[PDB]
Amino acid sequence: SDLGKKLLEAARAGQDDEVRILMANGADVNAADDVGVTPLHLAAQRGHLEIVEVLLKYGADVNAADLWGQTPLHLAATAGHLEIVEVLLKNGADVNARDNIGHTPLHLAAWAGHLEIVEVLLKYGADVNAQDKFGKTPFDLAIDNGNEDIAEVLQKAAGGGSGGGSGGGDVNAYDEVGWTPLHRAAWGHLELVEKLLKNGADVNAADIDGYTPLHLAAFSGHLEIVEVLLKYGADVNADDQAGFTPLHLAAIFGHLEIVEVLLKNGADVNAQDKFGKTPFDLAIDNGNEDIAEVLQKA
Template identity: 40%
Template sequence: MRIADHLVEAAEAGDAFLVARLMAEGAGVDTRNSVGRTALDLAASRGHPEVVRLLITAGADPEQRAGEHHESTPLCLAAAHGRTAVVGALIDAGVHLRAQGRMRWVPLVLAATSGDRGHPQTVTLLLDRGADIDAEMKSRTSLEWAARFGQVQMVRQLLGRGATPTTNALAAAHEYAERHRGELWN
């Protein structure tokens, strides 16, 4: 197994001691493993903030392409998985909060809409640290996406934080209610 594979495996497992040792032995901090993933990519998506900080301190590019198909960034992966501490570490490292990656994903939209209810703590952190609450991804804001997916608690949270209640958000909520009429009233 190549040293890069060991580094990525250690980062994915959250083993900061082994990550530091492998880098000291010459593992390139941004080297991709045999399937094209980096240590930062997997540490961010798996939720290991201490490893993320270690890799960034060692020179890892915090805005590198990440994800299975290199479509994302470490921040977008962390936001989508609700890895709040990792999101904080990446913001501390200077990562911008605008649309990113090949897909132009907006971290706030991902945090607000991933999973069954979004990730409220991650949304709070992103907003507290300066994310634009009305930023659009594929022509929809986080509020519009949350309404479209029927995530009532997230809609409330975003409105409470000052999201603009657009006609598109209202229409999305109405469409969701119509699609799920039987589920909502039973």
């Protein structure tokens, strides 16, 4: 117990000598602190290969879960410790263990951008189709975080191979916040927005908060994306749940060129948000007088 704490500190500190001393003196290899963290957790997390190996030789529980459901393999995979991931897998680690969000090690490797870990996990039977509690696959998490090389590997492993890194699947798929590929692409990925629209993406898909891609493009200030969305039928006066139209958003954030494009495409200057404010009102409130002039003249 007292030895148990000392083994935890030693394992965390990567003090190989003290770990062996403490073991020789009868320390519990499966000691755990008050949040379920074990020496193997700490050694695996912090890249202490030799300590991971000796703990496992002495019978450390390779699949011990802490309070957050995490196993040592979760932590090693997140950290990108390749050799430790292999050792854990060679010592009976559950390759598809779940943390409390439902992440598998493959999710976490994809999240953290560790290509060699992703390949290793797949080799040892990782479930390429695993979904976390928010419906995300490892492929989804890779795509989200811009890890394109990993996305390619995962899509091929899932049997829909070729062209994964540049996104993949149904152009009208949606996740739990109601985001379609077009919602993601609206944030400055012009060529991808174009491709999606040409491939039949719903230009007016509203997410769980009521935002269309045009709202998000207006928010992030991407003129050419605002233009192409409108060209392919975007609802210029779509209102979110807060009553904001894209013209409201452009007026708040001082996007004059976008304001002009929206007006040209039939934006309503009299539209009121939930607080009764028009785009002109918000332009004044946010110190954008030039836009206010254009809006009044309209």
